[PDB]
Design a protein around this ligand. Sequence first.
Ligand SMILES: [Cu+2]
Ligand SMILES: [Cu+2]
Ligand SMILES: [Cu+2]
Ligand SMILES: [Cu+2]
Ligand SMILES: [Cu+2]
Lengths: 362, 79, 79, 159, 159, 238, 238
Amino acid sequence: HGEKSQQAFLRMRTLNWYDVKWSKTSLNVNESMVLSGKVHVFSAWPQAVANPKSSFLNAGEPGPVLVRTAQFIGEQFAPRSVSLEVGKDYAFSIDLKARRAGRWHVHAQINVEGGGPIIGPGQWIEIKGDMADFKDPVTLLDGTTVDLETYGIDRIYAWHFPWMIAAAAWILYWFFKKGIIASYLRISEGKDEEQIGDDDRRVGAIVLAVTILATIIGYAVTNSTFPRTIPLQAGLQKPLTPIIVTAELKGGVYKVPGRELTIQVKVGEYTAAGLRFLNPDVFTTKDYLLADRGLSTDPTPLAPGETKTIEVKVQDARWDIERLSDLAYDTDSQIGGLLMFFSPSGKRYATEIGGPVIPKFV
Amino acid sequence: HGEKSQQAFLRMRTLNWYDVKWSKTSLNVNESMVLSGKVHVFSAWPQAVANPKSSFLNAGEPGPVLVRTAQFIGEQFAP
Amino acid sequence: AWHFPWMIAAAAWILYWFFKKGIIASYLRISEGKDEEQIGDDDRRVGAIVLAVTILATIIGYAVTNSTFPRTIPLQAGL
Amino acid sequence: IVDLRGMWVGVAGLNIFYLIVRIYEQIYGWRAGLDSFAPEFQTYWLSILWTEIPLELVSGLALAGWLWKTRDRNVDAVAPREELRRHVVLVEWLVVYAVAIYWGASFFTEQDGTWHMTVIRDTDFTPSHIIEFYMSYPIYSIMAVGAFFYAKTRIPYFA
Amino acid sequence: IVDLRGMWVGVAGLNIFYLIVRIYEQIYGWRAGLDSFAPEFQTYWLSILWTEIPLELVSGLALAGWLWKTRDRNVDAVAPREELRRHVVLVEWLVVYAVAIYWGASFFTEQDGTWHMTVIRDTDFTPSHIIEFYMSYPIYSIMAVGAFFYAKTRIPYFA
Amino acid sequence: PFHSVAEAAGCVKTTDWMFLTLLFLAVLGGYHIHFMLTAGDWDFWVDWKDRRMWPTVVPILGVTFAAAAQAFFWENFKLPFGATFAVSGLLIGEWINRYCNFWGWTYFPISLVFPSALVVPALWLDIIMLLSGSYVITAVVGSLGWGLLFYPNNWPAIAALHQATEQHGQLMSLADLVGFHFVRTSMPEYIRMVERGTLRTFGKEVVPVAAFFSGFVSMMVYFLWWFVGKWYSTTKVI
Amino acid sequence: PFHSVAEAAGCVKTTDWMFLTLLFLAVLGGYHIHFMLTAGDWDFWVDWKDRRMWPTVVPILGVTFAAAAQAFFWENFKLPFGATFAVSGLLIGEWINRYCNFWGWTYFPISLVFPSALVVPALWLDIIMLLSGSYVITAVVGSLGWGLLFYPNNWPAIAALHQATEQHGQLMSLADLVGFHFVRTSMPEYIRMVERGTLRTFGKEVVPVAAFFSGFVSMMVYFLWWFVGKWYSTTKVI
Ligand SMILES: [Cu+2]
Ligand SMILES: [Cu+2]
Ligand SMILES: [Cu+2]
Ligand SMILES: [Cu+2]
Ligand SMILES: [Cu+2]
């Protein structure tokens, strides 16, 4: 449903996806679900990609099988873009609503119009029933209760068609003044107004006035299929309220191909590719986009007031499967992501990474 | 002398004009007057309008009937 | 050793095609009625060859020079 | 003598082919060919690729041969009844070539516009993307190369 | 009768001149003409400027005069042996004009590209910059104004 | 020649009828395919269906076809069945692709997506054409309204879908929201030109054959330029 | 006329030979000078020798010369010694200037700087030309590979200089680093056009003389346009 085919490099330095869940899992024809996520905006944003100044979160809905009751991002539900910040973090979740049958993965993505569509983790949604039902409603201030997935379509065909009607009104009608051939030689051969001359002309002259007069109608009657109507709302809102350990990576190496990566983070878990690299040294997992027996550490604990030149080993399968050993291509060989460190109790102070990792092949 | 014909929306989100007065009211052929004002620059600036990074304060003088001895804005008189 | 041995297969057309008479001997050798004296067969199949020779003698480079290393990177840059 | 619908095989042999292709792309591409790394793609989908180019080369050349060595040869001097009869045909192809286009212009040309607005693009090898950039155009590109290839060798003027 | 290398003076009188110029620019420009405010520049370098333009005007006009009043005058009606003999010459100049270009196109035209990538540019009066924008082009600009100036007045057609 | 006057008339009114199509269901294509890339889908998503930005594009772009198409047919057949000949093509072209595809494939509300009305203009064109059958005249006037008419024309299909509701302390248009619901993605590629200036062209273009005679009469491109009313047909945006 | 058949043949095979040069060591110039400004030195510094950005420029730009040059020579002399006739010029042109200048003047590693290989393409061009000597055909096919071949061609001279080392916790290509070492500067000016559309032109251009007959046959510019394979010869970048 996307990814993989996204040179790691950037996919791993544009947006850090942690805390991602999903309300339901089996919504039905009309039950709502909520994409759940908190995402970090890397600090050393890839010059390649434009400034995530303006962007947008969304439904990775292969074909809209759910809907869009509303959204949550930064400190607001926004229709147009919003502004993520180089370093800060914003929470988000997005209301949808089963509308169509099927059972497909569903990603949460903050697509950046500034040159990019970055997709964070997603999760299948067993929607059940028959699209045949489903009805996404709402109501114009006027109080009028309307059903969206089927409002006005009637209006269209009822007008955006009755011209494809007055269409033949020329088509056929003008196969009277002899179609081609009977019109062609009917042309070179001396002057040929046989096609034109009067009649013919005044005939259209009419159709014209008919047509136009039969148009002032629409703009008048359709000027009453409401009396008060607005433009289309859009733009941006500078606002966006964020949320509320120190890594360095000085030293790094990884596979080619393999599924391993080492680090020398000097000062829990590890994300980057929206991927999980739990510190099994403390976990009990609660899919393919996450690594259970994730991070491999030196079990020596780091507690308040202290420090260490710690070394971290990233190992698991999904680091190859989901395309990460791709740093072969990707211009800037650097890496990126997070470091989910927790309290002896379990209260995660989280630092990030970002560093030029070096590879070694087969 | 302008305005009105300025879709509110923006006119109401670009610059906040408070504390506005005028030195004289009846200056004569050569007496100086001073436009008086303190203005706020909205926080959620309309993406429509470009960043007020560079701009300029001025005389809405329909035809120059006064002049320009100097200006005051920010912490400076700028040309 | 490579970015030259073509400035080599260079003359391979240069001279070689001064056989089917250089200019003049080719020009009037042209206006004057149809003139395939330059073309016709032979000539053509000759290149047809050189072409296949050249290309086949190119899959080489991309194969052998695909082994003057096995693993190589792009060019690193950015900010 | 002055021919009927040589368009039989034409319109028919097409509208159904093409139509169907729309059905087959309803299934597989939308329940298999929904990811290029997903096998159900490279067997029950990406299959119609090394399946289409092959043909659209032998076909391209197909008319090249047949439609050629099957020319009046001793054309020009020809039955003044035959000319405005060999057009009846010529002006028949450009009619198949006609509709033929419609698909590579008003179908898999704009259908690839609804597809863009579904998947976060895998490769230039998605469904609509496969039956357009690679199918539809080359698909009838031949038609043309024939409906002129025929017309140049089976008709006077075109010499 | 049908001439030899009138190109003697040509190719020779050039390849050495130009060549040398490359030697002289090896020294001074690169050990004097390395800064426009540095005197060793305006004497042992910027010297080849009010030294080149002067010539490239008298020279431009040079051929203008000589090459003119030295035309067949009563041309057109001319020795049918002489024509394809006065070309042997014409088609000789455009050969000097030839190589002539090469310098103002494949030398001090791209040499000024290695120079850009050395000094943090002083003025448009650096070395390569002086023997190109001012030398090389005007340098043979004349050649041309003659190898046609000759050809129009010493040959029929060109009238 | 032709045999009996009942064949000579036959293999005419039939080749003639069967002919008319060749043109349409072929020009149409070459046209839509264009109107697409040109009118960046201001004729696609109701949410892109605005006031300024929109009826300023389709208006213009929606002609170097609807125009030559005219100058074409009307010329050699003084058949004022041209300007409109074009349109329909696009409408019946898109309108088709609009259904089944968007609708029956990743089902899209026939509401969010649906082409813009043109049939009208075409007429006030093919007509200011019929009467007064000269270029310039049909250009200035004709082109003029051809754009003014645009929006006013589309009011019906458009108007209603602009009423507004208050979604979470904010304002939007039935339209807007329809765009909020049922989601999609980006643009999102490009190269889209080999297949064009290649074979599909000079492997269909050559006709010609070595000798002139052509549909290069599209010196209607002109027709378009004088559009500067469509850029007028804009300031019908307060 | 010509005197004895041993002069009449002489002052021919000699003016003819001496002639061939005039063209080459003159067209070359007018060509390189161009290929320079056009191919912004993606044919200069190995560090600019990449994948996308590069074999997308030289490819195209590297033709409205290698092309007309062809259509030129092959035309009036059905001498398929054209497309390649061009190239060499550039190569022997730059390759020259590359040495002595960059090298013997502010010495530059013959490594950091060194032109791109073209000889190959030229052939797969001057040939898909020879056989099948028609325009369009030589355009579509020919132009096509003319670009695909590009990179693959240059693999040799390029490939090796891309191995990588770890300079201070970071990664770079032999290439990259060669660019780090031995330094230079900027672009860094411009006006560069008087000398061009002046005298060097209509003071050499006029030829003509009042009457036509010309090398305006460069209606090969076309040749170039159909390049849309070179823009294809791009997506040979993963
Ligand atoms: Cu997925
Ligand atoms: Cu997904
Ligand atoms: Cu006022
Ligand atoms: Cu596409
Ligand atoms: Cu310079």
